[PDB]
Design a protein around this motif. Structure first.
Motif, PDB file in Angstrom:
ATOM      1  N   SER A  45       1.322   6.990  -6.657  1.00  0.00           N
ATOM      2  CA  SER A  45       0.061   7.629  -7.200  1.00  0.00           C
ATOM      3  C   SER A  45      -0.126   9.021  -6.660  1.00  0.00           C
TER       4      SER A  45
ATOM      5  N   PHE B  95       0.849  -1.179   0.000  1.00  0.00           N
ATOM      6  CA  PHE B  95       0.000   0.000   0.000  1.00  0.00           C
ATOM      7  C   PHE B  95       0.881   1.223   0.000  1.00  0.00           C
TER       8      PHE B  95
ATOM      9  N   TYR C 171       0.619   4.270  -2.689  1.00  0.00           N
ATOM     10  CA  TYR C 171       0.331   5.658  -2.493  1.00  0.00           C
ATOM     11  C   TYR C 171       1.551   6.553  -2.829  1.00  0.00           C
TER      12      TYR C 171
ATOM     13  N   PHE D 234      -9.596  -2.524   1.575  1.00  0.00           N
ATOM     14  CA  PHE D 234      -8.581  -1.468   1.381  1.00  0.00           C
ATOM     15  C   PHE D 234      -8.093  -1.426  -0.057  1.00  0.00           C
TER      16      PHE D 234
ATOM     17  N   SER E 252      -8.627   1.873  -2.262  1.00  0.00           N
ATOM     18  CA  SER E 252      -7.338   2.541  -2.642  1.00  0.00           C
ATOM     19  C   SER E 252      -7.021   2.412  -4.100  1.00  0.00           C
ATOM     20  N   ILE E 253      -6.888   1.227  -4.609  1.00  0.00           N
ATOM     21  CA  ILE E 253      -6.360   1.055  -5.976  1.00  0.00           C
ATOM     22  C   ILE E 253      -7.449   1.129  -7.018  1.00  0.00           C
TER      23      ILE E 253
ATOM     24  N   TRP F 147     -10.304   4.969  -5.543  1.00  0.00           N
ATOM     25  CA  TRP F 147      -9.541   6.224  -5.418  1.00  0.00           C
ATOM     26  C   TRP F 147      -8.472   6.321  -6.504  1.00  0.00           C
ATOM     27  N   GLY F 148      -7.745   5.211  -6.857  1.00  0.00           N
ATOM     28  CA  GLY F 148      -6.668   5.289  -7.865  1.00  0.00           C
ATOM     29  C   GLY F 148      -7.185   5.213  -9.327  1.00  0.00           C
TER      30      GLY F 148
END
Ligand code: HEA
Ligand SMILES: CCCCC/C=C\C/C=C\C/C=C\C/C=C\CCCC(=O)O[C@H](COC(=O)CCCCCCCCCCCCCCCCC)COP(=O)(O)OCCN
Ligand SMILES: CCCCC/C=C/C/C=C/CCCCCCCC(=O)O[C@H](COC(=O)CCCCCCCCCCCCCCC)COP(=O)(O)OCC[N+](C)(C)C
Ligand SMILES: CCCCCC/C=C\CCCCCCCCCC(=O)O[C@H](COC(=O)CCCCCCCCCCCCCCC)COP(=O)(O)OC[C@@H](O)CO
Ligand SMILES: CCCCCCCCCCO[C@@H]1O[C@H](CO)[C@@H](O[C@H]2O[C@H](CO)[C@@H](O)[C@H](O)[C@H]2O)[C@H](O)[C@H]1O
Ligand code: CUA
Ligand SMILES: [Cu+2]
Ligand SMILES: [Mg+2]
Ligand code: NA
Ligand SMILES: [Zn+2]
Lengths: 46, 58, 144, 105, 49, 514, 43, 98, 227, 79, 84, 73, 259
Positions: free
Chosen positions: M103, M96, M100, M249, M253-254, M257-258
């Motif tokens: 990105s 993770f 982050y 998560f 996250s990926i 959000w990504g």
């Protein structure tokens, strides 16, 4: 069971101090000699 | 299916001095020998592969 | 008297100036005359001789304080042997110079170093404190 | 904790217990020598008389040696304490470590 | 009874100290080691250019 | 019987003995690599080859000393022998998994020696930074063999950490709280929590390096939008906790040794010592970028890491002053283990203090990647972790073996080693302040005097390591069997005799609640 | 600590032999490699 | 919604697990899972220390919250005292053919 | 450059390096004094036959052990962080120079006006001119104007390197894909030497940096002649 | 305003040691400017400030690779 | 949240079965529908040989060295573009 | 004869500690005074005296005449 | 005869065969990546599988058949499993962190933007949301299984555990299909790198967790669990919740959000 007591709770014999000296010389001497022989090997390749 | 756990409890508690990984009987010895042979033979083969890989090739 | 490995879990004797009365007597088995001495110790101590009193002390304890606290000559052996083996080290260093190391670079030749020293002074290496500060550019010599 | 006199009095009382046993004599002296002090004459007198009730001449001598030892390099303390104990030494027939030759290395 | 240190301690101290000083002085001064000390007060600077 | 006992062990003492023999053999490999470094540097010019063979030797020197000598001796060797005895437990919680943590280490060491034999070795530094460690500047198998050596050593230690935490939390007598366990048991519990949280982050980072080298990922390669500096953060997020893992069991052994040879029943300030080890373990996770003060981070980040790194001196100071307060009033016994522990207190304090110099990032600009850093960490490792190891080895050798060493030879050994390591490392401070870089096979001529002295020092330490081997041989050759040991009421590991039977505490201790 | 006298005493001469053998075990193989470095280097 | 077919521990536990469960139902602790509660520890009312052999190690936490535990072997026979606080303990051997 | 038997830092060539030397003096005395205080208690604890072995109360003395170190750390961190924020302050450079690290040599680019760039390699020992320094000289020095604030931007075209000049207090890592900035201002003319400070493979020891600091008008004519 | 350009001035958008985005942003601004100017008939001389700034800051290999990629149609920034 | 459902009292298999068949499996059935709707043939973008994509620093250890492990010819171009 | 006086018998280790922790501090203050004086103050004054009338062009011309520069003959 | 409640394990060869299987797997991967050969690698995977099987077989023999898991031993194994899960959480945290890092500060080579130029992310409302519903549903069914087992209900424990496994297998087949369908690959810079290594290690753990649930299913069929003693089931459930949380998560996250 297994042997108990001084000199019997180890994977090497201490029954004869000179055979022990030889085994300890081979064991610690091989660890200390290895990097010199690896250097010799890396020098002799190229 | 029927609950045969008592039969296995009697098998594995038999007072025969066998360590647990051989206490199920002859098939355990066979599987142990296979595993240990592949591990020890593979380890020798890995050492051979190091000897080979330790020198430049033509 | 004799202490045995198989006695390890039993109360034991120790001479320790910080534990003056240990957990057992140094001698527990008594001869006929030693038994008679412990019976005499039940009566006035003024009737014991100096030797009987010393015998009672040595049944109870092994060494006195003066004996267990004595100094020794061991430091001479330690410091001498450590100097020996440090001296043996310099043989290894002598052997390595002789048989392992080749000549060092030509920049350490005296004439190179005199020229390099002049050029470091000409470029004022460390002119505040470290190097050229120690040269007198007016008298053309090292500062006294 | 307490004043010096109260500390001393508790130790005098400890050793003066008429039926103090051998274990208690040893516990008392081996505890007492852990403290930062050389025991006053009156504590030592009561421990010596406990040695007498326990018919133990040797431990009386050892207690005199541990008084000397606890004084460290203060070589004036032990002779003062033996001075103050002389009446009890004579009364009980206790010879000092020096009178017994037990101060020789 | 005297132990090893009482009997041999003086000679081990004297011989080890003597040996140690002698071999380190020899190593430091007699076999061509280049310590590269400071030139200050030692080297006379010479024209290089 | 020999194979069942020594290859199929489920016994914490025999596994501990296996780790001590492995760690001793690794220590000879690491000593030989340390002497090859100092032979290259002991006169100006080139002895061996260029910086590739040189920095293969420097890289292997560090991995051997850290992962095959210190961690196996402190946690696998003294942890397994002593923790179960100090809590009265019959073995570790997972005695069979414990034996796999041991047997993973010969294969991990084999991988590392294979990395040095294939191609031109991994000449990367023990930090293995890309792109020097990537597949263009280190093409071929050497760096992959190093990564895999580290994966096996990481699994061994993660499973060991689970074992120790579980054993220490779950297998004490039911009346004993964790505030009635000895300091060395606390030091192993805290080291194990640091291992459990840090090693998985290293495994993530070196796996990313393995896929950039073999699967065309680009985590650290800017051509794919990756960043070499991300590897540095992941590495050092483990690497700073790792140095506290190297020293914490040393601090636990030092607390025991100082207390024992001061003739004390307990260390001064036991709850302060527990607080200090927990504080050092916690702060050790929030300081790692002090290894990165020259990579170009923002100024406020550099201010926070300077400050947080300095704060660790507060709890570390509490432990130093509490070891001095434990000596205070002691009946001091000048045994060879006490000499090692007193050498440790002063030489660890010198190295912690040069650590505080380096925490100042503006000064670390000039000191980073120079021999001042090498001097800092060798005073805490060669004169702190090694001196705690030698103190614990000579103190507990009669427990483990039943035989005594010759104390005069052991004092001679401590004297030679103390002169040697200080000759070796003290002059490296001058070399670092005057600008000699790390990882150099040769140096500008001005640096010759202190490199010559430092190399001479390293040969004195070699004489000490040789003599240590003779001293262990002499003890086993003479067989003076132990009779009585002092202070067993406050050193439970001795109370079963020397050596203790194969099974101890088959009947557990009795401890009431009151 | 207290201990029994040695069961198999190692006299000064025996210690000199064990100490010499131990030092030669470390010094001879490394000394042989370093003596021959020029041999390995210039082919 | 629900039926049976899952064995209970009463039915199917075995070996040491079963011994511990049967002993606990009787309020007995042959495998030393609980901490023993102290007596007043005087010579008249010593802490009674069970054992299956002639001696057992005692740890004495002499005062509440001490971090130091004082350890010693307690042997069959007359009560012994903790060497730090003097509290008394007496061995009560025998059994597990219990 | 360093000189033989040197114990401390190279003399300062820039005001920031001067500040570091006084900050080091301040810190080292503290190092002295603590290391001396420790050794001296140690020796006081170990030199008496008086004893006190019973339990000792820790709380009072632990207040002293925490508070006096905390105050010492604040007495180091206050000047330490003044210097850190001083080096970061805005200064207005007159010139920007980039340097790219490579295996194993540095290139330099001065492209404010013209496209001036060149490589800078160590002089091999067998080619040194008499008086020149082994492992430190280069063929093409980094000529720069003295008494002027210069922005140096540092990167790499291969593996990591690190561009250092100790006498100016400078070390900035050279990372491919990244352009790191530092400031340089020399108070004096002269030749100021540094060496690659991040392990970078077979000739890491042999890719040095030599700055040549001269008056602006000489720097200008040198720059023109290097096109 | 500014001839007698000496070098790129301090830019509060990029105040830290890592100046990579300063180089990139000026390179983009220049080329975005020049595209706007070459299009609408106007004059590329107005884009000159961005050109001086990115030439001062950017490594020659970065500019050269970004220029090759714009010619190839593989430049990944938006112009 | 309390979310919007509502019941307790000391806990149970019947309730967790009710949540599995009455909320969890229906949600999976709905998402399975939603995914079915939007499945099949999207329109692959022009190939552009961007240098930050299709990275090859070492050949892959399978195949011809140039195809990713779950290479889909329809949508994964090689470094030289889409395959025949 | 004379009796010996009663000596102090209590707190002898604490008394010794008290006395010497004071001597150790008093010394740290004395060494800090020598340390400021022999190293730190000496440095400040060496740099201030060096630069007080330093003429950097004259230094440059000396270097230039000695032949040290690539860019200036 | 002991009088504590802990388990003294018989001497065993599995730690050694497991260590050797690790040497064979890693020297095998090195042979595969550098010397074009899979031989050592398949020998190591085979011996790792044999080792795992006989070791956990013996833990079942020791517990269900021999009775050595007293409550104090089970409490140890509780702590062991929790600590193991914490180490696996920290292993994922490294990935993770990498995601982050790259990105949040996308470099010029990417276009200075995230997702990079040229990357066309999957739509997180399509198969990724389906996978999310699948693993959340399986956390509900795994809870039903646990309560059925505590209530002594064999049939419904098996029915709920089979549903849980079926959903684990559904997620793994959906993820395999998504990996084949995705228009970007592991070689598509740091987007493909973070995406496939982080979801690929998560997929491996879904396969490990599903295998562990299948082991519990066959042991339940063989009546090994009692309504009060079933730590293997508890550990597999805790591991299964860990695999679901890691997925949430990753999804946020990926994939979301990504994108
Ligand atoms: C056992 C190993 C060990 C230990 C315990 C430490 C402890 C510390 N180290 Fe060290 N360190 C290493 C091993 C260790 N180090 C290694 C191997 C490296 C190099 C990694 C590499 O690049 O390869 C390194 C590198 C390293 C660096 C990076 C340097 C650079 O590369 O430029 C820094 C920077 O902050 C640092 C600081 C510290 C500090 C502040 C401590 C502190 O924890 C020390 C605290 C202790 C004290 C302060 C002493 C006792 C205190 C008193 C008596 C109280 C009075 C004191 C004060 C008021 C200050 N160390
Ligand atoms: C449904 C998911 C399960 C994965 C199934 C595939 C097989 C591998 C199994 C393990 C998965 C774990 C992660 C390992 C790294 C990479 C695999 C990532 C997941 C994956 O499978 O990624 C695939 C690439 O696999 C590749 O390169 C494959 C290369 C396979 C070799 C793996 C490398 C060996 C891994 C080293 C692991 C080290 C372990 C660390 C232990 C830590 C110790 C504490 C993606 O295919 P693609 O064609 O690029 O793009 C899709 C285009 N349509
Ligand atoms: C960079 C920062 C460095 C900071 C360094 C600061 C050092 C601090 C200095 C310490 C002084 C304060 C403590 C003074 C005690 C000294 C030792 C001693 O004095 O030994 C004893 C004191 O111990 C007692 O009780 C009280 C409990 C036990 C003693 C506690 C002693 C504290 C430990 C001293 C530590 C020494 C090492 C310091 C490390 C720096 C003396 O016994 P008392 O006469 O009191 O009682 C006797 C009982 N009666 C009176 C009832 C008969
Ligand atoms: C794709 C292949 C390559 C990767 C390899 C992994 C492959 C699949 C492995 C699947 C994991 C299977 C674990 C099966 C364990 C069975 C033994 C067991 O469950 O044993 C239980 C004890 O738990 C115990 O040890 C708990 C033991 C639990 C440990 C397992 C957790 C996972 C380990 C996985 C390895 C992770 C790899 C990480 C990669 C980065 C036995 O006690 P009970 O259940 O109370 O029974 C007793 C009652 O009958 C009494 O009435
Ligand atoms: C860093 C760790 C090591 C540091 C120091 C080692 C100290 C040296 C111990 C001696 O080693 C031996 O030295 C001999 C020379 O003295 C060598 O013989 C070599 O030289 C002899 C004399 O020239 C010939 O007779 C031999 O054949 C030839 O092998 C021999 O091979 C080598 O074992
Ligand atoms: Cu370039 Cu080191
Ligand atoms: Cu660190
Ligand atoms: Mg660096
Ligand atoms: Na060299
Ligand atoms: Zn007690």
């Amino acid at each position: 069971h297994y042997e108990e007591g001084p000199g019997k709770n180890i994977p090497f014999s201490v029954e004869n101090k000179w055979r022990l000296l030889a085994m300890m010389t081979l064991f610690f001497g091989s660890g200390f000699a290895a990097p010199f022989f690896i250097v010799r090997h890396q020098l002799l390749k190229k | 299916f029927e609950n045969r756990v008592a039969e296995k409890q009697k098998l594995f508690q038999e007072d025969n001095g066998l360590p647990v990984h051989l206490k199920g009987g002859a098939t355990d010895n066979i599987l142990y020998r296979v595993t240990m042979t592949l591990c020890l033979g593979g380890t020798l083969y890995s050492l051979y592969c190091l000897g080979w890989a330790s020198f430049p090739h033509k | 008297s004799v202490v045995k490995s198989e006695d390890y879990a039993l109360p034991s004797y120790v001479d320790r100036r910080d534990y003056p009365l240990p957990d057992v007597a140094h001698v527990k088995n008594l001869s006929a005359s030693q038994k008679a001495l412990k019976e005499k110790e039940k009566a006035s101590w003024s009737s014991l001789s100096i030797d009987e009193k010393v015998e009672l002390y040595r049944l109870k304890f092994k060494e006195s304080f003066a004996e267990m606290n004595r100094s020794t000559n061991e430091w001479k052996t330690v410091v001498g042997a450590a100097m020996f083996f440090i001296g043996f080290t310099a043989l290894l260093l002598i052997w390595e110079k002789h048989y392992v190391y080749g000549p060092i670079p030509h920049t350490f030749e005296e004439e190179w170093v005199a020229k390099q020293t002049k050029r470091m002074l000409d470029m004022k290496v460390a002119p505040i404190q470290g190097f050229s500060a120690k040269w007198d550019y007016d008298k053309n010599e090292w500062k006294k | 904790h307490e004043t010096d006199e109260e500390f001393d009095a508790r130790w005098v009382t400890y050793f003066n217990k008429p039926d103090i046993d051998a274990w208690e004599l040893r516990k008392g002296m081996n505890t007492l020598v852990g403290y930062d002090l050389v025991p006053e004459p009156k504590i030592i007198d009561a421990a010596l008389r406990a040695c007498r009730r326990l018919n133990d001449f040797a431990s009386a001598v050892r207690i005199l040696e541990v008084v000397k030892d606890k004084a460290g390099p203060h070589k004036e303390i032990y002779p003062y304490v033996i001075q103050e104990l002389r009446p009890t030494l004579n009364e009980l027939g206790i010879s000092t470590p020096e009178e017994l030759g037990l101060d020789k290395v | 009874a005297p132990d090893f240190h009482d009997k041999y301690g003086n000679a081990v101290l004297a011989s080890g100290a003597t040996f140690c000083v002698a071999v380190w002085v020899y190593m430091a001064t007699q076999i061509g080691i280049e310590w590269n000390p400071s030139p200050v007060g030692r080297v006379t600077p010479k024209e290089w250019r | 019987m020999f194979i069942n006992r020594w290859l199929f062990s489920t016994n914490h003492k025999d596994i501990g003995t296996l780790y001590l023999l492995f760690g001793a053999w690794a220590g000879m490999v690491g000593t030989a690599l340390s002497l090859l470094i100092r032979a290259e540097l002991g006169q100006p010019g080139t002895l061996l080859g260029d910086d590739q063979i040189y920095n293969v030797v420097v890289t292997a020197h560090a991995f051997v000393m850290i992962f095959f000598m210190v961690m196996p001796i402190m946690i696998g060797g003294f942890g397994n022998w002593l923790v179960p005895l100090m809590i009265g437990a019959p073995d570790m919680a997972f005695p069979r998994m414990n034996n796999m943590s041991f047997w993973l280490l010969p294969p991990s060491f084999l991988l590392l020696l294979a990395s040095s034999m294939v191609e031109a070795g991994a000449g990367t530094g023990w930090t293995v930074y890309p792109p020097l460690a990537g597949n263009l500047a280190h093409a071929g198998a050497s760096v992959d063999l190093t990564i895999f050596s580290l994966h096996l050593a990481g699994v061994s230690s993660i499973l060991g950490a689970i074992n120790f935490i579980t054993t220490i939390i779950n297998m004490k007598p039911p009346a004993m709280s964790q505030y009635q366990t000895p300091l060395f048991v606390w030091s192993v519990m805290i080291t194990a929590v640091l291992l459990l949280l840090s090693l998985p982050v290293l495994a993530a980072g070196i796996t990313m390096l393995l896929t950039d080298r073999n699967l065309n990922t680009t985590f650290f390669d800017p051509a794919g939008g990756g960043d070499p500096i991300l590897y540095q953060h992941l590495f050092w997020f483990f690497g700073h906790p790792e140095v506290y893992i190297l020293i914490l069991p040393g601090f636990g052994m030092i607390s025991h040794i100082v207390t024992y040879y001061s003739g004390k029943k307990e260390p001064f300030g036991y709850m302060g010592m527990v607080w200090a080890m927990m504080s050092i373990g916690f702060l050790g996770f929030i300081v790692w970028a002090h290894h990165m003060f020259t990579v170009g981070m923002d100024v406020d980040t550099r201010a926070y890491f300077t400050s947080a790194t300095m704060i660790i001196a507060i709890p570390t100071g509490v432990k130093v002053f509490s070891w001095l307060a434990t000596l205070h009033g002691g009946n001091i016994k000048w045994s060879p283990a006490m000499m090692w522990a007193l050498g440790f207190i002063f030489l660890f304090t010198v190295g912690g203090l040069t650590g505080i110099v380096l925490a100042n990032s503006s000064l670390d600009i000039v000191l980073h990647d120079t021999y001042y850093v090498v001097a800092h960490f060798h005073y805490v490792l060669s004169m702190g972790a090694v001196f705690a190891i030698m103190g614990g080895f000579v103190h507990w050798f009669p427990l483990f073996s039943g035989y005594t060493l010759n104390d005069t030879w052991a004092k001679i050994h401590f004297a030679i080693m103390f002169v040697g390591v200080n000759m070796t490392f003290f002059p490296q401070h001058f070399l670092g302040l005057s600008g000699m870089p790390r990882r150099y096979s040769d140096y500008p001529d001005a640096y010759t005097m202190w490199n010559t002295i430092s190399s001479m020092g390293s040969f004195i330490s070699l004489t000490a390591v040789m003599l240590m081997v003779f001293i262990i041989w002499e003890a086993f050759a003479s067989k003076r069997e132990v009779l009585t040991v002092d202070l067993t009421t406050t050193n439970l590991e001795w109370l079963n005799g020397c050596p203790p039977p194969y099974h101890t505490f088959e009947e557990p201790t009795y401890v009431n609640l009151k | 600590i207290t201990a029994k006298p040695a069961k198999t005493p190692t006299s000064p001469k025996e210690q000199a032999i064990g100490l010499s053998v131990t030092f030669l075990s470390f010094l001879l193989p490394a000394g042989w490699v370093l003596y021959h470095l020029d041999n390995y280097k210039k082919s | 919604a629900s039926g049976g077919g899952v064995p209970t521990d009463e039915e199917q536990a075995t070996g040491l697990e079963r011994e511990v469960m049967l002993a606990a139902r009787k309020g007995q602790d042959p495998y030393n899972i609980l901490a023993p509660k102290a007596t007043s520890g005087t010579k008249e009312d010593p802490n009674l220390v069970p054992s299956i052999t002639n001696k057992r190690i005692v740890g004495c936490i002499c005062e509440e919250d001490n971090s130091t535990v004082i350890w010693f072997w307690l042997h069959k026979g007359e009560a012994q005292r903790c060497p730090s606080c003097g509290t008394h303990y007496k061995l009560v051997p025998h059994q597990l053919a219990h | 450059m360093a000189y033989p038997m040197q114990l401390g830092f190279q003399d300062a060539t820039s005001p920031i390096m001067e500040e570091l030397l006084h900050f080091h003096d301040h810190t080292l005395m503290i190092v002295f004094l603590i290391s001396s205080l420790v050794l001296y208690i140690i020796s006081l604890m170990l030199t008496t036959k008086l004893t006190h072995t019973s339990t000792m109360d820790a709380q009072e003395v632990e207040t002293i052990w925490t508070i006096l170190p905390a105050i010492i750390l604040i007495l180091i961190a206050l000047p330490s962080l003044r210097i850190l924020y001083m080096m970061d302050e805005i200064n207005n450079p007159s010139l920007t120079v980039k340097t790219m690290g490579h295996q194993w040599y540095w290139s330099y680019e001065y492209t404010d006006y013209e496209d001036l760039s060149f490589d800078s390699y160590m002089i091999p020992t067998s080619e040194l001119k008499p008086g020149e320094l082994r492992l430190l000289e280069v063929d093409n020095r980094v000529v720069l104007p003295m008494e002027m604030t210069i922005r140096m931007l540092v990167s790499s075209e291969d593996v990591l390197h690190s561009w250092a000049v100790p006498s100016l207090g400078l070390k900035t890592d050279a990372i491919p894909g990244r352009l790191n900035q530092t400031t340089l201002m020399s108070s004096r003319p002269g030749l100021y030497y540094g060496q690659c400070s991040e392990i970078c493979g077979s000739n890491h020891s042999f890719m040095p940096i030599v700055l040549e600091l001269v008056p602006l008008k000489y720097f200008e004519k040198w720059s023109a002649s290097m096109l | 305003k500014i001839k007698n350009y000496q070098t790129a001035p301090f830019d509060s958008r990029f105040p830290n040691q890592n100046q990579t985005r300063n180089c990139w942003q000026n390179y983009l601004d220049f080329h975005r400017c020049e595209k706007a100017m070459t299009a609408k008939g106007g004059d590329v001389s107005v884009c000159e400030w961005y050109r001086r700034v990115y030439k001062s800051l950017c490594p020659i290999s970065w500019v050269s690779t970004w220029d090759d990629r714009r010619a190839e149609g593989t430049f990944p920034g938006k112009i | 949240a309390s979310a919007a459902k509502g019941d307790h009292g000391g806990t149970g298999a019947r309730t967790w079965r009710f949540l599995t068949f009455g909320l969890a499996l229906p949600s999976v059935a709905l998402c399975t529908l939603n995914s079915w709707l939007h499945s099949g043939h999207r329109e692959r973008p022009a190939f552009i040989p961007y240098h930050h994509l299709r990275i090859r620093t070492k050949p892959f250890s399978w195949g011809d060295g140039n195809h990713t492990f779950f290479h889909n010819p329809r949508v994964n171009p090689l470094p030289t573009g889409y395959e025949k | 004869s004379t009796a010996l006086a009663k000596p102090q018998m209590r707190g002898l280790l604490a008394r010794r500690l008290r006395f010497h922790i004071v001597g150790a501090f008093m010394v740290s203050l004395g060494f800090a005074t020598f340390y400021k004086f022999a190293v730190a103050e000496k440095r400040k004054k060496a740099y201030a005296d060096f630069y007080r009338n330093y003429d950097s062009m004259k230094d440059f011309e000396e270097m230039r005449k000695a032949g040290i520069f690539q860019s200036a003959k | 005869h002991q009088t504590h409640a802990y388990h003294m394990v018989n001497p065993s060869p599995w730690p050694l065969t497991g260590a050797l299987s690790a040497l064979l797997m890693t020297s095998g991967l090195t042979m595969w990546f550098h010397f074009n050969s899979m031989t050592l690698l398949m020998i190591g995977l085979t011996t790792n599988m044999l080792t795992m099987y006989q070791w956990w077989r013996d833990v079942i023999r020791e517990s269900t058949f021999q009775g050595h898991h007293t409550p104090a031993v089970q409490k140890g194994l509780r702590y062991g499993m929790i600590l193991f899960i914490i180490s696996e959480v920290l292993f994922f945290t490294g990935f993770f962190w990498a995601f982050y890092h790259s990105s949040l500060a996308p470099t010029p080579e990417l276009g200075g933007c995230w997702p990079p130029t040229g990357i066309h992310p999957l739509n997180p409302l399509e198969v990724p949301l389906l996978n999310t519903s699948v693993l959340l549903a399986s956390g509900v069914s795994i809870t039903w299984a646990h309560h059925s087992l505590m209530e002594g209900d064999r049939k419904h424990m098996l029915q709920a555990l089979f549903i849980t496994i079926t959903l684990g297998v559904y997620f793994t087949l959906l993820q395999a299909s998504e990996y084949y369908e995705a228009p970007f690959t592991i070689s598509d810079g740091v987007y493909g790198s973070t995406f496939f290594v982080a979801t690929g290690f998560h997929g491996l753990h879904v396969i490990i967790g599903s295998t562990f649930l299948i082991v519990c299913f066959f042991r339940q069929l063989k009546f090994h669990f009692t309504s009060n003693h079933h730590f293997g089931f508890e550990a597999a459930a805790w591991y299964w919740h860990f695999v679901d949380v890691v997925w949430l998560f990753l999804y946020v996250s990926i994939y979301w959000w990504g994108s």
